[PDB]
Amino acid sequence: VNKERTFLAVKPDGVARGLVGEIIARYEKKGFVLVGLKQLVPTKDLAESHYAEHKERPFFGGLVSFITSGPVVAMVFEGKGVVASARLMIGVTNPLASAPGSIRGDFGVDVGRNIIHGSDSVESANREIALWFKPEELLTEVKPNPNLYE
Amino acid sequence: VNKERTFLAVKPDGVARGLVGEIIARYEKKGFVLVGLKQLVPTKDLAESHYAEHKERPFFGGLVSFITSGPVVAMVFEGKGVVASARLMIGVTNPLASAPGSIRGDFGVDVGRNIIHGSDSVESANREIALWFKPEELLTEVKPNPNLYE
Amino acid sequence: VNKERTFLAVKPDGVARGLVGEIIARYEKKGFVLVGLKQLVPTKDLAESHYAEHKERPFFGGLVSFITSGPVVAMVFEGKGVVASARLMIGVTNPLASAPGSIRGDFGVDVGRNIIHGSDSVESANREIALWFKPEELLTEVKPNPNLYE
Amino acid sequence: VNKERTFLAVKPDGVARGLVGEIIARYEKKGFVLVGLKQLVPTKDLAESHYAEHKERPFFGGLVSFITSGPVVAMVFEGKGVVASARLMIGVTNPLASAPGSIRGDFGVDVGRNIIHGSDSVESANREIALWFKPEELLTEVKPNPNLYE
Amino acid sequence: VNKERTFLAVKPDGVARGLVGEIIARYEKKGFVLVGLKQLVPTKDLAESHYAEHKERPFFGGLVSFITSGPVVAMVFEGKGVVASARLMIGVTNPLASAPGSIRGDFGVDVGRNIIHGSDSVESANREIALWFKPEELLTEVKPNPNLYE
Amino acid sequence: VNKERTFLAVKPDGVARGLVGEIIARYEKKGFVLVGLKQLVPTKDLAESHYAEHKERPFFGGLVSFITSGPVVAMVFEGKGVVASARLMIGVTNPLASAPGSIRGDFGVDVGRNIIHGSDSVESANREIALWFKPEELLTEVKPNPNLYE
Ligand SMILES: Nc1ncnc2c1ncn2[C@@H]1O[C@H](COP(=O)(O)OS(=O)(=O)O)[C@@H](OP(=O)(O)O)[C@H]1O
Ligand SMILES: Nc1ncnc2c1ncn2[C@@H]1O[C@H](COP(=O)(O)OS(=O)(=O)O)[C@@H](OP(=O)(O)O)[C@H]1O
């Protein structure tokens, strides 16, 4: 349904490099509605929890540290197939393998500093959202440009 | 030869969402010459005739209505391999499956409202052109940036 | 009223330099609705008539010749104070005195090749329109983004 | 000092027309740091309090309603002379009289729907900020591109 | 004559902030031809000589130091009235006072780090050019888009 | 290592069509540092040597001729995996087969005039670089945005 949602978060490197508006604009132009938005610096707790499935991976160490080394613009978009489209638009893990046109492909270079995070599945979406956003912070209703869907 | 032409038409949603300029600019930046251009509201007759090959398809119903529910910017471009290139740049039918950088992949979200139409073969081009444009409305001669071809 | 109209025409140099979409996009982004659009090569008659008020000026010679030396994308936009806003966005006669942000300021250099024409007054608007467009070629109705006006 | 801050808020039409990203990007490109950001629907109380100085003005009626008829992206930027600069970049009250390059001059058309609001004085900034943002939602420290200041 | 030239130089902050391409593109779009281009780190000797006219000015110390603290992309453009046009495009000394649309107005914030330098007069152009480019490094001939001048 | 380098060169058509700034900006946005830059007209000697590997290929004649028919903007970028990243960004030989988003895919149409050249391997990079730049013209040190690498 045209009410699917995903969790996106411009990480400390996207924020510091001034890529917040560019990244948001790409999604707005696509047709997805912003449903929640806010800036905060993640806590170790939030980072670990957010990155739970990578608990015993060599990189989990650095993920947690960096994602809490500064402000993060957390956000929630909504729209048909937003979870698949978002990831698609984001690119692939390694910015260097990301095709031009995608976020990481156009702006990224080191997997350590790959600008943004997008939920991988509606399952991780629903969890990630409920982790970063008090339900109060999300639009109870949404009306997309009528020229978007049939 | 560097004289092939394709028919393109920003559909009611492209036009209504204000994507006429961006769409044209993308092909102008590519190296193709506008040989014709015009805005109008297609008639049931033209829509049906335009969508002939999909007469007995479940969606044809909605195709003809929508493409006539408002203004359409019909246009004809020219240049080497313009037909294959236009489609590539337009993306795939479902905007969600269209790669970033393509028209439908950057601004589309529903198959029902997918912004633009490009001729799929030189065969359909020749026909589609002849349908929307009286031959008088088309450049009898063209001169592209000399820096474009060899 | 939000129904005022103006006549714009990307001249042979804007067209040849590939500035059609860029110029159209600027107006679309502003909030004005396209009401008519078409491409044609002006005839000596049309040029002279169009440039009537400059009949005995040293430059009238060249204006007429050049504006008929190639295709011209004639168009008609609509919206509140479109005639004043259009000119504003176009810039001033001499591209070099045109501030950055305007069309001529960003793209122009020689007054001889100043990319575009915009009607100077609603009076010249109403005349110019009726000169370049058979009434049939203009939308009988218009519905702008409801987010545009109050 | 390089710590001055101003309050900005993309109004319902900016948000609805999908201009959140572009607006933010313009200030990010300028050199200012986002110290706070969030989206919400203002309450009659906040709108009235926000528009206090215009209590007995004919338009105040519509100001409070509209700014509460939908989501608003409130945000706080920081940097040298940010208040005077923001306003300059925003343009003048009437979007039609706003020069190209400014926000209102590039995308606005009606005084009623003029996209964004910027604090007019450091005095109103300090107040406006304190109204929409709990001090917890604001960066306690900021570090701008070292290439920005001397 | 359409062969006047000016010396432009992206200072260390423009270079470090990644504004080289944007700045060149702005002039390329305008109509001016690149006649010389190169990246180098100014030597104290060159900075001093280049800033000769401000020898005993308070800021002279920092101008020389900063402009040699890193790579500068020196360039020479050519075109009718380029010197007055480049300056207009660059904006005014204080980036805060630069109108949106201008280089300094779109990206600068401190007078000390104001991105780029443009010759002030044809007098200074001829001089400045002769100072940073060996005559061999400048095009002996130039052919601008024929759609540019009359 | 984040110090790998590649040789890029905007060919005469990219230079003449005014794509220099756009092409540099694309790489600047990606994360790569400009380490050398300059504009020159290739001599037959250099074109031949540069195209050595295609000595007895049918197209070799035109490659050498065309690349010396005008100014070429030679440049050397630096960054982790730049050689494979630059190539990806450039697209594939036939601009018609280049995906949208890539340089050749966004602006090129003929294999003969395909805008830019990027080294194919670090082997060719080291060689090509050594051929168009005297070691003195390349930065002896580089400091990329700290928000780029881990
Ligand atoms: N090698 C390495 N070094 C550092 N950080 C890394 C590395 N591999 C993965 N990551 C980041 O951790 C998340 C891994 O998600 P993936 O599903 O892409 O894992 S994998 O790398 O593809 O195996 C994912 O973070 P988010 O995308 O922010 O969720 C990766 O970007
Ligand atoms: N010196 C000179 N040489 C060539 N062409 C010229 C010259 N002066 C004006 N024009 C063009 O003619 C129209 C004149 O309109 P203006 O009202 O601007 O006249 S004036 O030049 O300001 O006196 C106007 O054309 P449009 O803008 O296409 O209507 C000018 O661009």
Q: Is A37 close to D73, i.e. CB distance below 8 A?
A: yes
User: How far is Cα D43 from Cα D29, in angstroms, rounded to an integer?
Assistant: 32
**For an interface test with C, which of B17, B30, B40 has the most C Cβ atoms less than 10 Å from its Cβ?**
B40
Comparing alpha-carbon positions, the chain A residue that sits nearest to B102 is A101
For residue B90 the two structure tokens come to 């337009």
Comparing alpha-carbon positions, the chain C residue that sits nearest to D62 is C150
For residue F72 the two structure tokens come to 């070429």
Nearest CB partner across the interface for A102, out of B66, B100, B110 = B100
**Strand arrangement of the beta sheet that strand C5-10 belongs to:** B116-118, B5-10, B72-78, B33-40, C33-40, C72-78, C5-10, C116-118
Beta carbons of B89 and B128 less than 8 angstroms apart: no
Question: In sequence order, which residues have a C-beta less than 8 Å from that of residue E106 and are 6 or more positions away?
Answer: D26, D29, D30, D101, E98, E100
Q: Is C114 flagged in the annotation as binding?
A: yes
Name the minimum distance, in Å, from the CA of F39 to any CA of chain E.
6
Q: Is C59 flagged in the annotation as binding?
A: yes
**For an interface test with D, which of E23, E109, E114 has the most D Cβ atoms less than 10 Å from its Cβ?**
E109
- Residue B54: active-site member: no
User: How far is Cα F92 from Cα F103, in angstroms, rounded to an integer?
Assistant: 9
Q: Which residues pair with C118 in a beta bridge?
A: C8
Nearest CB partner across the interface for C18, out of B20, B29, B37 = B29
For residue F78 the two structure tokens come to 């630096």
User: How far is Cα E57 from Cα F44, in angstroms, rounded to an integer?
Assistant: 50
| DSSP letter (8 states) at residue B144 | -
User: How far is Cα A78 from Cα C11, in angstroms, rounded to an integer?
Assistant: 43
Neighbours of chain E (3+ CB pairs under 8 A): C, D, F
The residues spanned by each domain of chain D are 1-150
User: How far is Cα D83 from Cα D7, in angstroms, rounded to an integer?
Assistant: 8
The residue assigned the tokens 């020689």 is C110
Cβ under 8 Å to B: F residues 21-60: none
For residue D43 the two structure tokens come to 């309450």
First to last CA, chain A: 12
Question: In sequence order, which residues have a C-beta less than 8 Å from that of residue D61 and are 6 or more positions away?
Answer: none
Cβ under 8 Å to C: B residues 3-22: 15, 18-22
SS3 letters for chain A? Answer: CCCCEEEEEECHHHHHCCCHHHHHHHHHHHCCEEEEEEEECCCHHHHHHHCHHHCCCCCHHHHHHHCCCCCEEEEEEECCCHHHHHHHHHCCCCHHHCCECEHHHHHCCECCECCEEECCCHHHHHHHHHHHCCHHHCCCCCCCCCCCCC
Calculate the CA F62 to chain-centre distance. 18
Calculate the CA A145 to chain-centre distance. 22
User: How far is Cα C84 from Cα C5, in angstroms, rounded to an integer?
Assistant: 10
Detail the DSSP E strand segments found in D1-143.
5-10, 33-40, 72-78, 116-118
User: How far is Cα D28 from Cα A16, in angstroms, rounded to an integer?
Assistant: 10
| DSSP letter (8 states) at residue E120 | S
For residue B41 the two structure tokens come to 């509201």
For residue A76 the two structure tokens come to 């929630």
Q: Ligand 2, from C56, C83, C93: best to mutate by most atoms within 8 Å of Cβ?
A: C93
| DSSP letter (8 states) at residue B79 | S
Beta carbons of F76 and F3 less than 8 angstroms apart: no
Q: Whose CA is nearest to atom 26 of ligand 1?
A: A117
Burial class of residue C94, CB neighbours in 10 A (0-12, 13-18, 19+): middle
Q: Which residues pair with E7 in a beta bridge?
A: E76
Q: Which active-site residues of F does the annotation give? A: 117
C1 inside 8 A of chain D by CB: no
Q: Is D87 flagged in the annotation as binding?
A: yes
Question: Which atom number of ligand 1 is nearest to the Cα of residue A9?
Answer: 28
Residue F73, H or E segment? strand F72-78
Chain B residues in contact with A148 by the CB 8 A cut-off are: 13, 109-110, 113
User: How far is Cα A103 from Cα A90, in angstroms, rounded to an integer?
Assistant: 5
Q: What angle do CA D111, D112, D113 make, to 5 degrees?
A: 95
For residue E148 the two structure tokens come to 């540019």
For residue C61 the two structure tokens come to 């010679």
User: How far is Cα B118 from Cα B8, in angstroms, rounded to an integer?
Assistant: 5
Question: In sequence order, which residues have a C-beta less than 8 Å from that of residue F69 and are 6 or more positions away?
Answer: F12
| DSSP letter (8 states) at residue E52 | G
Technique that determined the structure = X-ray
For residue A78 the two structure tokens come to 């909504």
Q: Which CATH fold topology does A1-150 show? A: Alpha-Beta Plaits (3.30.70)
Query: Ligand 1 pocket: which residues have CB below 6 Å?
Result: A 54, 59, 63, 93, 111-112, 114, 117
Q: Which residues pair with B105 in a beta bridge?
A: none
Beta carbons of F29 and A106 less than 8 angstroms apart: yes
Angstrom resolution of this structure: 2.8
A to B CB pairs, distance under 8 Å: 55
User: How far is Cα E130 from Cα E134, in angstroms, rounded to an integer?
Assistant: 7
Between the alpha carbon of residue A17 and those of residues A37, D137, F143, the distances in Å are 19, 21, 15
User: How far is Cα A44 from Cα A35, in angstroms, rounded to an integer?
Assistant: 25
User: How far is Cα B26 from Cα B24, in angstroms, rounded to an integer?
Assistant: 5
For residue E149 the two structure tokens come to 């001048």
Q: Is C107 close to E26, i.e. CB distance below 8 A?
A: no
Question: In sequence order, which residues have a C-beta less than 8 Å from that of residue E143 and are 6 or more positions away?
Answer: none
User: How far is Cα C25 from Cα B25, in angstroms, rounded to an integer?
Assistant: 9
User: How far is Cα A82 from Cα A32, in angstroms, rounded to an integer?
Assistant: 7
For residue E85 the two structure tokens come to 């046009």
